[PDB]
Nucleic acid binder design. Structure first.
Length: 50
DNA sequence: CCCTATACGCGGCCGCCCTGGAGAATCCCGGTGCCGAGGCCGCTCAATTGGTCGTAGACAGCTCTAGCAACCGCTTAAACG
């Protein structure tokens, strides 16, 4: 993913691990980045590696 | 036996072919005069040297705004085949 694209309407139910390669200046952008897989209904423990 | 015409060799004069010494034209050398260029001298004024002083600009500091790299997203009119 590019971090600042698509808005909040992107669906990633099947994902489990989120790797932030590049940290953003705005932490809300990173929050919506690993919030793509950590929404309501996730069946697995979401883990983020920065 | 003597005179007289007769054909034949040729002393002298004139013209033609071959070679030698004197003079004239030419090239080289030495002395000398003139043009281009280089060196020297005289004036002479502007560059040089020394000192003084004002200030132009470098430096530092603080504040605000434009630019820049790299990304996004939407519209739509322009570019392209």
């Amino acid at each position: 993913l590019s971090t600042r694209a698509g808005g909040l309407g992107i669906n990633l139910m099947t994902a489990d691990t989120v790797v932030i390669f590049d940290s953003d200046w705005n932490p809300q952008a990173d929050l919506q980045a690993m919030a793509r897989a950590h929404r309501i209904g996730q069946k697995n423990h979401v883990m983020v590696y920065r």
